[PDB]
């Protein structure tokens, strides 16, 4: 929902990476949310139980 | 041509000061609410502009 | 007739910027002007306590 000037293409975050973009073919404001959510947690009781 | 100016005055190149002028976008990259800082070919503050 | 135009020279300085919500440059702070500007660029903030 930001204010992209027509030359402004790349939104940067505080972490200085790519945040918000625009298609060079069609003028449109986009937002990016990265994939690879978290890790694997395993719950188990005692094996003898 | 070779015709000179009518009232060409031989004046020296006098000096003033660029107060906050010469602040350009370093690239075509959008930012939001951050305090970025970088080095590029700038207009220095308060220097003798002709 | 009455006409004014000014000439500046570009030099590799280092500046501090401030962006608003809309992403325009709101404020510009030099680094290598005085040790106060050096301090403001060192702290990555122009509000030194
Ligand atoms: C501009 O140049 C003159 C000498 O030509 C010098 O005295 C003056 O300090 C300079 N201006 C600044 C802001 O340094
Ligand atoms: C952003 O632009 C809108 C457009 O009118 C304005 O109302 C708002 O105050 C601006 N915000 C900033 C932080 O400049």
Curated annotation (Swiss-Prot), chain A:
Superkingdom in the source lineage: Viruses
Effect recorded for residue 15 to D: In strain: Alpha/B.1.1.7
Sites carrying sugar chains: 48
UniProt function note: Attaches the virion to the cell membrane by interacting with host receptor, initiating the infection. The major receptor is host ACE2. When S2/S2' has been cleaved, binding to the receptor triggers direct fusion at the cell membrane. When S2/S2' has not been cleaved, binding to the receptor results in internalization of the virus by endocytosis using host TFRC and GRM2 and leading to fusion of the virion membrane with the host endosomal membrane. Alternatively, may use NRP1/NRP2 and integrin as entry receptors.
Self-association and partners: Binds to host ACE2. RBD also interacts with the N-linked glycan on 'Asn-90' of ACE2. Cleavage of S generates a polybasic C-terminal sequence on S1 that binds to host Neuropilin-1 (NRP1) and Neuropilin-2 (NRP2) receptors. Interacts with host integrin alpha-5/beta-1 (ITGA5:ITGB1) and with ACE2 in complex with integrin alpha-5/beta-1 (ITGA5:ITGB1). May interact via cytoplasmic c-terminus with M protein. May interact (via N-terminus) with host bilirubin and biliverdin, thereby preventing antibody binding to the SARS-CoV-2 spike NTD via an allosteric mechanism.
The protein's name: Spike protein S1
Species in which this protein is naturally found: Severe acute respiratory syndrome coronavirus 2
Source taxonomy: Viruses, Riboviria, Orthornavirae, Pisuviricota, Pisoniviricetes
Full protein stretch here: 556 to 604 of 1273
